[PDB]
Amino acid sequence: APDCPEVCTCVPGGLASCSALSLPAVPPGLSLRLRALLLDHNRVRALPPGAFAGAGALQRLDLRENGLHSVHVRAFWGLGALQLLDLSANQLEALAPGTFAPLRALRNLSLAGNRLARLEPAALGALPLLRSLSLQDNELAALAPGLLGRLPALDALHLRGNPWGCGCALRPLCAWLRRHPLPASEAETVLCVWPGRLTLSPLTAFSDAAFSHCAQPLALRDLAVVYTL
Amino acid sequence: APDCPEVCTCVPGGLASCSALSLPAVPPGLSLRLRALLLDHNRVRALPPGAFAGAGALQRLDLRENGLHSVHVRAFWGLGALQLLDLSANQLEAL
Amino acid sequence: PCDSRGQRMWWAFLASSMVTFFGGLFIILLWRTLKYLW
Amino acid sequence: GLRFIAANDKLWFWLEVNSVVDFFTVPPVFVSVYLNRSWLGLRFLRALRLIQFSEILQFLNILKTSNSIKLVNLLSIFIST
């Protein structure tokens, strides 16, 4: 069938699997008849722009254990209907802003086991329909404020195995955790890293009193006092 | 059993073996019921701080042939009872 | 605790110093002009 | 305040280097004490206060001869800048 890649295996219903093929690049001949694509355990180190062009009706895309290190801003071309992304177990150190912008129907985004030192609010983009995230096994030192402000439907998150520096930089991070009770199994595996004075301290146990000295938002009384002092 | 990792194999007595699994990181869900842990022949290059948190009663820890290159100061958190460490056959250049 | 700096509010000190200096200059100039204009 | 009381011309005293460093040094420390937050901003201007040393020595009558006055002036200006 023309809608199936020659080297891959396809089944009725638009499910295509290309695993265990040692593909050096993305297979060509994408079709709108395929709904799910599997590409794990390959060697597609570089993703060309518009690699997934043609399969606009695809719903699930997997790229786990593929050694990804750089993704173009327009690589996710023709994927407005894509819902599942698995970029975990890769070597992604940086993400260009606007890469995930067209993914309006994204529901699960995997970034585990990656070397992403910093994740920026503009990197994720507008993700209203997103329900869960996975940022474990990364080098995320701290989450910049405003990253979670564009995820109204975010209800699940994984942060185990990260170099969380417990300071005022993660006050918005704790704000999400307080109103989203993490399971005790996952909570016990989330701890501070630096400074050493706060080692072995779970992030959910830090309350407002513990960080009352953090930078409060500018008020109107202190605004006049600083001018008039 | 909840005290055993899903991808690893455990036997009665708190002995858990995770060898020959190609684990990219330390398995989660550590428990105090496990006394010995095996993690050799994996690809856990980086050890996050407090990775072994929870298994304070562990006695034997193995990390041979795992390509370790840097260990955090607080990584082996909650291991006052740990007795055996095998960091050999790795790429540790500084401690 | 530590790491008490999430953002920067450097403008407060600079605004205070600048408003002090410029208010002094403006009040002195206003006094001079009022004396000039009796 | 004592200098301002004794100042002859107020406008030209407002533009002196010592006055400027006082204006940009004291209120920021007051605000830092008020807000319990210290910022290392224009605090380096205190070295400009090092300039007013030859006048200090001449007021105390320690520094009289012309050569030593000029040497102290040059050294203070150089180090302060």
Swiss-Prot record, chain A:
Isoform 1 is expressed highly in normal prostate and salivary gland, very weakly in colon, pancreas, and intestine, and not at all in other tissues. Isoform 1 is expressed highly in many cancer cell lines and in breast cancer, pancreatic cancer and colon cancer. Isoform 2 is expressed in cancer cell lines. Keywords: Cell membrane, Cytoplasm, Cytoskeleton, Disulfide bond, Glycoprotein, Ion channel, Ion transport, Leucine-rich repeat, Membrane, Repeat, Signal, Transmembrane, Transmembrane helix, Transport. Residues 1-222 are extracellular. One of its GO terms (molecular function) is voltage-gated potassium channel activity. Disulfide bonds join 4-10, 8-18, 166-192, 168-214. Residues 1-32 form the LRRNT domain. It is found in: Cell membrane; Cytoplasm, Cytoskeleton. Residues 162-216 form the LRRCT domain. One of its GO terms (biological process) is potassium ion transmembrane transport. Coiled coil: none annotated. One of its GO terms (cellular component) is plasma membrane. LRR repeats lie at residues 33-54, 57-78, 81-102, 105-128, 129-151. It comes from the Eukaryota. Auxiliary protein of the large-conductance, voltage and calcium-activated potassium channel (BK alpha). Required for the conversion of BK alpha channels from a high-voltage to a low-voltage activated channel type in non-excitable cells. These are characterized by negative membrane voltages and constant low levels of calcium. This is Leucine-rich repeat-containing protein 26. The lineage of its organism: Eukaryota, Metazoa, Chordata, Craniata, Vertebrata. The gene is LRRC26.
